[model samples]
Target chain A: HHHHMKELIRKLTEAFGPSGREEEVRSIILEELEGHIDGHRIDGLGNLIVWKGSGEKKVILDAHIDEIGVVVTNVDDKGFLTIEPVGGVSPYMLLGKRIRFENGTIGVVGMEGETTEERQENVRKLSFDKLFIDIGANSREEAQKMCPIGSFGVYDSGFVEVSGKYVSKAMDDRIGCAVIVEVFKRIKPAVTLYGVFSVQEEVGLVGASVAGYGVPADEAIAIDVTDSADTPKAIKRHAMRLSGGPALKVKDRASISSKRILENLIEIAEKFDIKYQMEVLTFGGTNAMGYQRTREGIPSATVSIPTRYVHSPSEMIAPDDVEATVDLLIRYLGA
Target chain B: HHHHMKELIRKLTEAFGPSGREEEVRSIILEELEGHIDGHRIDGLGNLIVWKGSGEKKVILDAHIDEIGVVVTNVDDKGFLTIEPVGGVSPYMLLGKRIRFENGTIGVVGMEGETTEERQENVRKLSFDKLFIDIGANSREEAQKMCPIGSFGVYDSGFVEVSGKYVSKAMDDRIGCAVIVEVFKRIKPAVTLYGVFSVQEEVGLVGASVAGYGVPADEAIAIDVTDSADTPKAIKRHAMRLSGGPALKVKDRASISSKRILENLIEIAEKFDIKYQMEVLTFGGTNAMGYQRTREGIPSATVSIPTRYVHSPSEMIAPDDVEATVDLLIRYLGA
Candidate 1:
């Protein structure tokens, strides 16, 4: 099971899906859900809505399929591309990093500064405007032909295993998608379940905003990654750590978890002896905001996988936490 | 001196300034700075730039003049005005609150829902869309004539001294403006100091975005209010408390404080026996972001006054914190 989970994580993280353009990731998820879900449909905003068990109590489970990346806005002379962030792409993380377009065309991020002092200053106070992409083309026409304007590109980093942790670029939410897929295959739910592979979450929770209206569930649980502060010189504002088990989000910048759902999650985690921690992130939000504000609001809480270096090229997570998250969900659904 | 300070806080907090419509507040500030500063000018974005002292080193002290409020978007048949937030106005805090337009026209915020359960649910999960303002007008024409679609309205709450802490609307920044005003009056600086009363900061730090280029300072310190964690049931993600002296910000969502300026402020605080605290806010940004990201970036840090119930009608702050901030700035500028 652990080996298969790693393979799924690798496949999903490697797929090309940046915010509004989530076709590649959606296709892969559809293939994985084949013969597992009872019924599924793609919505207007490209949310893949899958369901299982037609019982009375309705619950919605969400995991965004989109990842943060850059979009080419202008192709300048000398084959350089001026790009904008599709999500929260930090300029510090972009320097010297490689980006891969959907068509397999590669580009390297470069900064605009004349001297070393100027470059250092620019990097110190970096914004998207001071950055450009070089696709190894000589002129504008050459670059446009290979990677046109409006093309989306993601980090060209590959998935790898170091010791007991899995490292990849899009682990932010792809790992959550893998957990949902595994749950769909394993759970024999006594209640109705809606597993929504949401889109555009990296860009302001766009997909799950409408999913709440479509699913109309009594409660929701969004699966995603929470930043772990176990690195060197970390501020330790919140108590999230790698290998600390699944994080039951208490509050974040976006929304507060409903008391009922939070209590239920705690009860289930303790009942099955699942390793879990409480997360109160002050920065960044997830799809839970979307579900929490839908219509008259659904009682929503997030089941976060503790992740390190989130929104960067390389994000890391423990295999034990992933497995533990799957177990918690299965037990909660009474499978 | 304490009585004067309280009066200044009351006048500034009661002034009409809501993001883009900051003329009234600017006028009040200009009146206060008369015969005190060396020279001043209003920029294109309505930022009031006042400079004092003439020496080698250049320093900028900024405090936003604008406050968060609601703007009338659409007027319904029965004189109801649909509104949108100019800044981070929580819908949960809007219901039943009074709004005062510049023309002295008063309105009350109302939520949309039919049944009691529906209204309760709407209040629990509130958004700007579910809110409307009623000004006691019989028809849409009356409403339009009194408070048109483009008209802006701020909280109608008045300033009051509650025990030792001062309470009022717009303390998120007006308190900062008062501090700068007092600093300008009292400081005898040895550096070329620019005391900027910036505008439209409630929206997105718009005024200071250009102030950096306009001032071109060697270093900067933004004076603003930060949310305090001293309230009951607060999450305590940060350690800011009322009367915990002035907060020397280490980092926030927008920009990290420059080490040199942070250290300098700390040294000055210790030398003067002024009480101080370190602030590492994970959410919210101040004008420092605008300064730090300006042309090659200025070495910037924020001197924050601990505030409670920020953005709500009744924001509270301790008098000692405000005085300490003023003393710290006066000493840092070599008064």
Candidate 2:
């Protein structure tokens, strides 16, 4: 089962699923759900909504399947491409990184400057404005044949395994996807469940918004990457750890994790002898923000995998962290 | 005369100086100080401590000479360079912007991803980690000859004229520096003055901390940018405006403006017909906090120029607004 989960992590993390382009990831997830779940279907925003055990209690289990990536804007005379950003990008990480398109085209990133000094100066103001991709095409027409304007792609870095943890390009929410997939395969739900593979969370939780309004649930638990604090620089500074079990969201920059849900989550973790840390992330929003603010507002909280270096080419997550989350989430949904 | 002041604004704003690197700015100010002020000297941490009236009362009027920038960290084999930020860099603002090093080297900033979709995915970070600078070097050897780790630089977007507006890089406190320079040239002080061109306000206010300890003052007035909210999206968000004269700090994230000083500033503004606005800026710290906590404690408040889109390459300011701050500060010192 552990090996299977690892394999699933490998598949899910490598899939092409940038925000608003979840077809490839959705299909892979649907294939995995074949006979493991009661019912499933893709939503308007491409979210793969799944269901199980019929009862009065309707609970939404959400894990965003979308990954962060880029879109082409202008193909220049020299065949280099200009682009704009879709979500929060750390420009420093994107420099010298590799990207992969759905059509199997790969490209290297380059900057606009005459000297390293100019590039340094440019980076001080770089928002995605001065960045371009080099596909080795000789002319604009040649570049068009390979990757046209409006074409989307993601960081081409593949998954890696080391020291009891998994590091991958799309681990931000892909790890969450792996967790939900495992839970669905193993659990015998006592109440009605909506195991939703949410979409476009990187862009602003748009998929969760649509999913929440369309398929309303009594309570929701967003199983996503809280990607809590780690590194010595972050020690006791916010205190959430990368391998410190699963994180229970208390509050964040966007929505505050509901108090009753938070208390209940704490009780479940302690009662099951599970390890957990409460997170109050200072930056970025999550699918919980969308789910918590849906039609008439559903009581919601996030049971997250404490990830490391999130939104980078390589995000890290411990297997124990994933298991703890899966354990806590299954118990909560059952109760 | 207006053209002369404009030239000063251009020269001061275009100078090469980031936090912990203020030698260039200090030299320019020293040249401007030829026979105007009583005397001046740079402190241990590069703070330009200028003196005027000699009496029992010591008024420390501070404006940071430093600006936000990047410090080189690593240069890859492909001539791509990495950096860590020196101050609060608005990630979106850096997109497509240019940078200039103190040595007059230039560079273009780039990100790793290819298309706008990828850039958007990457931007989900809004941090300093994923960006790089391209100085147009052919390889690591050529790049090393030009720049190295620990080499630092600032944004290179130069001064521009907008209709009824003055736009330039490093206007956060350069305008404040301009304001103080004008006040020193015009005001006949009633109290002994320390017209301080402080260093390193961007990097944790280290210069202010040193200056505060070395030259203790009875009271200090920090002249810096205090973030204005007046965009169409921020319409009625806060009452401050770019053309709305000067801003008096009521409170901010770091320090609450002294009540007595606040009342005094308001009195002077109202009594002398100075058009001003009260600011309760939600983000960022100023040198006021550093000055207020010096030695036994000096009561300090900020007298800010109502600037627009601060901390960007092309920060916008109104010359009329700057003159208003000058008028208000000269009166407050006299009062």
Candidate 3:
């Protein structure tokens, strides 16, 4: 099961799906869930809504399919491409890192400064404007033909398994998608269950914002990856640990988990004796907020896989934690 | 007492102290505490350390003196000034707002697009580079004479009391400063107390980072303002209200409050029947993290006054909450 989950995660994470351009990831997911789901449809905002069972009481299990990336804004005469973040791309993470366009055009990020002092100054005062991507093109015309303005790119990093941990880019949400996929295969839902593979969540929850309006869910649980504080010198504001278990989010920047849903998730986890942790994220938000605010309101909570170095090129997660999340979700919906 | 507190807050908030340039605010604080404190000295990083009593166990109480602002990075040929934020200055808040240089030169912030469509686009994709300060100068030479490159400027907003709530520009930390000043005058400490009016806190806890090394205190508590979540459309991730007394820090982005200190503060508040709330800030850090990391680590916590519109031109706080913070601190020190 762990090996199967890893392969699913790899296929999802390695797909080219940067926010608005989620076609490749969406098609892969649909093909995977072809005969498993009862009914499915793609929404106006490109959210793939997959239904498993039929009942009046609907529950949405969402995981954003989109990942963070950069969009080319300009092409200089020297063939260097100036870019802006499509989501939360940090300049510190971009320097010397490789990025890949949808068409397989790879570029190396570099900063504009001469001396070591000047380079250090740029890093200290870093922004997207001070950095450019080199694609090995000699002229602007050559670069533009390969990767034009408005072309999207993601981190050109590969997946690897290291000491029971899986590392790759886009693990932030691909791990969540894998959890949902596994749950979809296992859960015999008593209520109408939605496996909503949402898009454009990295760009302010754009897809999930409209998802709730279409799927009339009474409650929702967004499956996503949360930051782990088990690293050296971590502040430990959150109590999430890698391989500990699935993290039941109490609150994040966007929304607070509904009291009923949190209590239910906890009760189920305790009854089955499945490992879990509680998360109170201070910085980033998830798709749970979007579903919570849809016409009237849905009681929304997030079930998070504890991940390290989120939004970076090399995000990490424990295989055991991934299995634990699937187990908890299966019991939660089946019970 | 409320009127006196309002006056103190006004004086402190209106003073020109933008991170590294905290002289004006520091002098005003020193003058306010002239005959009250036992002894005082300015540290290498410009932190004003004021002692109150002599004992084996010394506890440092800190409140940052500096506030957020902008520093001029370029003087354009058209006499406009291009600026970068000294701290977290939101570009959304700068449109048409007035700014004041240390030498009293005034400027109005404006964006660089000509048409309404272009102007709307600029606002949507706003950054410091898209905005400029028009200081009413005809040429770069004229602008440089009045407000040269590297000159610092703060919001040119005034203090006001509206329907029992105090509104001002720098209320975020000035409210904390006022609480410290009032506590310094009232508390007869049983243990040695150091009133740390720290500098450059809006820029990564610069002053408090060093003050902890010099003081050799047993424990520390930072007095600062946390954001209020009682406004319209607030996420309510935190339970802080405008008049909900002082907020006891549980955790922030920088540090988690030591369990012993948090219990002690809560016990004192409960014993006195003083109102208080627990804060778990997800976004920002404080001087408490600096103190916690210094020389073998001090058990540090933060006592926060909840304020609205932090880092904006019109920050607001409740007078009752201010009085409550002062009352709580005096008891914590004097007990």
Candidate with maximal TM-score:
2
What value does DockQ give for candidate 1? Answer: 0.01
Which of candidates 1 and 2 reaches a greater lDDT? Answer: 1
**RMSD per model, one decimal:** 23.3, 20.2, 26.1
lDDT of 2 by residue, B1-335 (tens): 13247877898999988887787888888787667788877767677888888677788888989888888898888566788887777554554345676677666555555445755566654466667776655467877777787888888666765434677779988988888888888778888888888865444434354346367787788888866555322346556777677888734433343566778889998999988887874344457654344323566677888775566665777788888788888898863
- Per-residue alpha-carbon lDDT of candidate 1 for residues B14-47, written as tens digits (9 for 90 to 100): 9999988888888888788898888889877788
Clashing pairs in 1: none
Worst window of 10 by summed lDDT in candidate 3 chain A: A230-239
Q: Which residue ranges in model 3 land beyond 4 Å of their true spot?
A: A1-335, B1-3, B201-213, B235-238, B252-257, B281-296
Each candidate's TM vs. the true structure?
0.48, 0.49, 0.48
CA lDDT, every model vs. true structure? 0.77, 0.72, 0.76
Error of 2 at A168 (Å): 0.4
Give a tens-digit lDDT track for model 3, residues A231-308: 423334555877679988644433343667888898999999888997764343457654454323566788999886
Sort by TM-score, best first. 2, 3, 1
Give lDDT: candidate 1, residue A131: 80
lDDT score, candidate 3: 0.76
Give candidate 2 regions above 4 Å deviation: A1-4, A201-213, A250-258, A281-295, B1-335
